[PDB]
Symmetry: C3
Subunit: 641 residues, 3 copies
């Protein structure tokens, strides 16, 4: 029937049934099963002479199975198979008891604290991999809605990472009777029999006064809001992505009243989540749905201590009837406490609290939730080593490799801050061995950012002509901007020593240099190589007060057009053995004063032309006047004096 | 008198008096009224057959009024007027009770979670506007001492924001009986009935043994320090602003002993606050006063459970007398618990604990651990969108819009970090639509800081002729510094492909380029336009080994002073068409060897002066010699040979 | 013997024995001693008329000595010399009790909150200085393993800081009976009486059922891992330092089972610490050993309430016998509780729980959280003022003094991040007076990092020419890179106003400037000084369409070799006054057309050589023809016409 006449607990340790000489020694039989934390075994035997543990040879690390038997139900279907973890002995004054404590076959997930990174795997794939890796048989795994680009395990316990993953995906972290892992969606509450049933023809119906020893049901509108929004940033388009989801319905609870009424009956507020990064529409939609489920899970909180039945496993629909106006209907169980003890028969505490750990006190072993000191809430910045540069987008994006976290974690691409903008800007890409400063997006490890490279040992900067600081007043003297080899621009200012001042656009080998030197107001374009100054429509209009073009070997001046030497004063045109002027055309001279044509060797006045010597007077002072042709047209016969 | 004979609870639901058929059912009446958190109603009726909620037609959101009546006091002046929030049913083994839970008319402030920014409004103005937004009638609001400039509400429950503001301003939120907000200063403890009074002529005097059912009074010097300082940074002057305030007095407590004695009797310590940013003297002084009040509020902790009186409202002075040496005097109440229950008449728990909400549990429900991760202490950095760059100071300050927080929050000016210094440095302003990386001052949202622009999709860097990485080892090859436009300063170094090395300066049109090219040692000054090299005291002293000046269509050389062409070897002065040395002054030519003046058309020697040919030999050896004028001074008559 | 016949509590207040008229009034004597928190008295007298405190003249800050006496043990050995801290009264319905709470002398350490930096001192030296400054006598201090460079005190209580040091160094802060501070290693558990000794003879042996009133012994493998590793970064070599330490043994516990048996019987996991920066091998080794000890301290948790004995001081070995298989052996006590009360004799509660504070509830006052709101986890960044720019390595580091933390804290060198790399990069050193934006390593204060200088009031004397923003749409117009004094490179782009575009490499005083101007396709190498353009193997090959070389007061062209003026068109060679060609060598001329040599004054044709005139026609036409020597070789006699 619904209650029980006699109830027994059958416990098997190490695969063998409990010895007949030890079965009467058992007193308490506690089993606390939940969907948020691993279930707990507490088997308390009475050992007045302190000899039990020396006979069972029980050492933690042994398989133990606990089954309840109420009437003829529960002979098959063992309740929970797990592992003995801790031992306790209590001399409380009412009996020197020996307590064996156990955890679920799968508690090892909480035992292991891991760091890792998973690339291009679905959440169900992550669950499958982690579980097997931990030696736990896989039951049924439900594929999740969307894939993840890159997940990082930020130094957390396996159980907690998987638990949050299930929370974000609106799942349940089920661990069934035979120790099989399960990642299953919540069962709909409608499945349970109608409360209008007789209440005695099944074991999933609770009637007020029939088999409800203790009852605590609460329906509240503490933080029920109709709309919940989750927001994120899209970098491939620079878009503010957002998702608004309703919180007016809930699958786990059906009590004739919905949270939509709670939202309507008060002012229409809204809730915002600003604690996790998001990138794609799928992730934002999933987060919005998860937050809506979280908000709607607090609508009803139920806790019934009943005579029980061994079929009250977690995650099953249970109908609550004849309680009142807002408390009828169906619920989905979340935690079940099977209790055997002094003066108490087989007791079952069914607690429906959504995904919260209301059981074992809301605060539980903390402040209502774990706040580890080695969590993912990384404040400020850290240092990292670059491992990859092969960005498929050529935006300077660079992979990282944290050296204080793990030797196999290399993260994903991280955008690096650069002095650019909306319409383009300069880039200073990093090498494959730099040590760069890394910040984080809202503290999350999944989204690192690169600020710039640091300076440490074995990475001293390239040496320069002048030191970093000088002078008694001890101010900055040089402000260097440089590449990784020596192609540099220097902005230096000094009043001591060499008194170097100004700007210096140098080269790697110092062969090429543009010195804007203020110490002597001198522009020095120095080059141990070729020089080339060119224009298109006009050439350098050189000016000043002293010009000089002294180049060895050769000097060629070409015009391809009109050429002019205005001068303005004496033009001393020296030579070194030859002066030549080509027969370009009508060559003409002139002078406002004298005109002299001297030489050292034989002169001549050539030309197949009508030579002439125009003048108001002409006097050949030649020591000898020789003509080898007849002389004509002389006005008078030659006369001396 | 002081104690009472008969005590009643008058509760009105929905504005109508409690029905006569329901009044006997009420058993438990609990009212918990405090000055730190909203008060609570707990009305527990006995409903064995579970039919109450189906007859009263109670839906949360309905108005409820609770009044106590002790003797002939309290018929008027209702105690509290609030709203039903949650429902609870209990089967505890002592009756099937139905519980209605209520909160204050103004609990909605804790219900709403908001993001917003307030500009140039006083704290009292903030409270008034905000409360009027939430549909709560405004009582008396006391004007704030100092005004603010920019307050950000960083995704917080509204009541918590208001409470932090009130704690900053040494204030109190006593919602009145009639549900009216009161932002009021604490009532001074001096204005209280004298302790040496008869103890029976007033309802504000408690005597040990007269009516004090339970007493718990503690006076401690756990963390009493005489002086407390608060410090901040002033940016308009670079000033370390500080305020030291005393903690030797406290308005709320007067127990013949002051915290000054506690501070003096121990070593003279000091306390510092380093958790919030401050900018002005007013804010720092207010923070120092608030911290001093907070420290002095822990001097005395009092908890008296007495027979009570319906006039024991919060925020009223109460005189405690005949208790001992240090426990006499007057206090100001902070929380009051009115209780009706099984085997208990009307009882009043008066608790004085200053700010500390130690009521119910010292840990309350979080062990004094308020870390809701409501994105308040934003860790590390985040991304933001620039909205305003006006800067009334021209220092590059920029208004920041956060895309993951709100669509209407645009913040105040943020001092972007610039790679300069104190006496002047280069400025890189950002456009009106950038995406920048912003840190925060000690995590507070009120003081964002811009680190630099980021790179995302649809904002690619300016295209360049050479790729960002090349080779098999493929180290960094190019280090570009550029404006949003094409003006660039490239520092490039390559070993493969085109083997481009050196420094480049480009104007974006690829016309004006300065190439310090190291692959072939060269300086190239290219420009699709005019060139101009100028000096003041001397001109470019050009040098090298192969000079060339070849500009088409024009070449003008001007001196305005002495001109010299030293040469040193052959000077081939070619020409085409015309070559004329039009010497204004005295011309003169000389030769170390021969001298030749040829022509093709006609050779002419001119000059309006006596021409002269002078040398040992002046032979013609040409052709016919014609003279058209008399020949003179011939020594010998012409003779061949 | 082991139990006691009659037990008394001897208390001395103010150095004088408790008065005879007050000794019967004492009711409750409670002492709580431990190695994690200061010891406490909770003495409780019965004062029905509330007059005790007015006669003893007790004022907190008075010395009090407390001792238990069970049989004839402890008559001259005091248990705890401390100071009265807080007074307390009670009307609990069972008497009007007066309670005097006292704390051990070490409470002063928890009473002071300090900010400071300690320089080149061992941890033992730090403890000695802290204890001496706080007026506490120094007992025995054990020198620690290694020294530290700096240890900042990030606004923390002295006691918490010293406890952190003790936990780091595997040390305990037990305070002895006389009140003398000592900093001691835990006593080994092996140095205890054999578990199988007589039992009654030794006062350090507890037997199940003999004198164990209450017992709670727990042995668990909740988080037992064989190996624990600690990781850190070395900057003098760029190295990943790591230390793996075993957790298979523990000095404090010896119970026939070791944590190695817990680790082996499960999967071989590992644990990592990622919350504390580390620099040297010694520090990493110390951290690994400390974490291993912390993990192994949770193997056994013991709580024994026994018949009491005054020799059960903290930090002494105690042998636990005849309990079972895994619970025999020895323990090192961690906290002791001496209790005298109503209907209760002298009770001693021994608690062995490692370094954890499992003594108070399960979460003390604030378990899990214990995050001082004013803690060391600095989120995001802050502002700081440079105080020293020197560097023993010249890598650009700098010391930073914080203006919101302390006036005497200047920190260590911070590796400022700037655009460098593995093989060298540019550096911008910071001046002494700069204000820089400083991040933090993992939030820890000990490792600040400088990002870059900020801008504030009277901090931007760049004094640039063009404004930082112009226009209606008013995008960024200028991108300045400059030096503290003015030597600058500007990348400016405008469309309105003066319409300036291009690049400008300027100087401090603007005398020297290289303008790449794009509004007018021009290169302006302007300089109020000398100019020098030089080459090595070839000279500037100037080109374009209009050459102009116009320099006043001088113009010198030198070749040192062949010189050529190709020309190609008219060559106008004017002269203000005088012109000349030197007698270099075989000077020659030529003309494709006419040839004219005119002058305004005395002409001549010099040359001490065989002058000649050659042509088919030699028509020398003038106004006369004078020869000063005889004519010869005339072909015919002169003839008119």
């Amino acid at each position: 029937v619904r209650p029980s006449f006699s109830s027994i607990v059958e416990v098997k340790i190490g695969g063998a049934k409990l010895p007949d000489t030890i079965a009467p020694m058992l007193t308490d039989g506690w089993v606390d099963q939940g969907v948020n934390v691993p279930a707990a075994f507490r088997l308390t035997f009475r050992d007045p002479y302190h000899r039990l543990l020396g006979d069972l040879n029980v050492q933690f690390g042994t398989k133990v199975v606990i089954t309840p038997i109420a009437d003829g139900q529960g002979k098959n279907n063992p309740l929970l198979t797990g592992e003995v973890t801790g031992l306790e002995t209590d001399y409380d004054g009412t009996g020197s008891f020996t307590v064996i404590r156990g955890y679920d076959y799968g508690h090892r997930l909480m035992r292991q604290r891991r760091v890792a990174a998973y690339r291009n795997q679905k959440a169900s794939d992550i669950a499958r991999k982690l579980v097997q890796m931990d030696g736990v048989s896989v039951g049924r795994i439900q594929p999740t809605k969307g894939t993840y680009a890159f997940i990082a395990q930020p130094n957390v316990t396996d159980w907690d990472f998987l638990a949050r993953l299930a929370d974000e995906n609106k799942m349940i972290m089920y661990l069934d009777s035979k120790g099989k892992f399960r990642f299953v969606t919540p069962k709909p509450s409608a499945g349970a029999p109608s409360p209008n049933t007789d209440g005695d023809q099944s074991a999933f119906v609770l009637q007020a006064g029939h088999d409800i020893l203790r009852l605590r049901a609460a329906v509240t509108a503490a933080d029920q809001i109709g709309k919940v929004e989750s927001r994120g940033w899209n970098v491939t388009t620079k878009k503010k992505i957002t998702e608004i989801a309703p919180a007016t319905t809930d699958p786990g609870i059906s009590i004739k009243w919905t949270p939509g009424t709670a939202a309507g009956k008060f002012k229409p507020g809204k809730l915002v989540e600003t604690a996790n990064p998001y990138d794609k529409q799928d992730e934002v939609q999933n987060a919005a749905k998860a937050l809506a489920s979280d908000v709607t899970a607090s609508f009803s909180e139920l806790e019934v201590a009943a005579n029980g039945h061994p079929d009250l496993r977690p995650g099953v629909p249970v109908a609550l009837s004849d309680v009142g106006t807002p408390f009828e209907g169906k619920y989905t169980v979340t935690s079940v406490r099977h209790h055997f003890g002094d003066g108490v028969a087989y007791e079952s505490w069914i607690t429906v609290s959504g995904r919260q750990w209301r059981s074992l006190y809301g605060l539980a072993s903390g402040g209502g939730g774990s706040d580890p000191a080695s969590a993912t809430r990384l404040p400020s910045v850290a240092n990292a080593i670059v491992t990859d540069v092969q960005d498929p987008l050529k935006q300077g994006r660079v992979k990282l490799q944290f050296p204080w976290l793990d030797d196999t974690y290399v993260s994903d691409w991280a955008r690096s801050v650069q002095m650019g903008g909306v319409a383009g800007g300069g880039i200073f890409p990093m090498d494959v061995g730099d040590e760069v400063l890394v910040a984080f997006d809202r503290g999350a490890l999944d989204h690192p950012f690169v600020i710039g490279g640091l300076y440490n040992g074995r990475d001293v900067p390239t040496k320069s002509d002048v030191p970093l600081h000088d002078g008694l007043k001890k101010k900055a003297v040089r402000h260097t901007l440089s590449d990784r080899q020596g192609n540099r621009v220097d902005l230096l200012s000094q009043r001591t020593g060499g008194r170097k001042q100004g700007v210096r656009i140098a080269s790697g080998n110092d062969k090429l240099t543009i010195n804007l030197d203020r110490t002597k107001t001198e522009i020095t374009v120095d080059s141990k190589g070729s020089v080339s100054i060119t224009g298109s429509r006009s050439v350098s209009v050189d000016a000043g007060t002293d010009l000089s073009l002294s180049a060895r070997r050769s000097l060629t001046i070409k015009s391809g057009g009109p050429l002019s030497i205005q001068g303005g004063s004496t033009i001393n045109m020296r030579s070194g053995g030859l002066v030549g002027v080509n027969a370009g055309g009508a060559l003409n001279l002139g002078a406002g004063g004298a005109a002299t044509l001297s030489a050292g060797a034989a002169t001549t006045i050539s030309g197949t032309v009508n030579v002439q010597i125009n003048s108001v007077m002409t006097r050949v002072i030649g020591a000898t006047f020789e003509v080898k042709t007849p002389i004509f047209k002389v006005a008078t016969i030659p006369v001396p004096g």
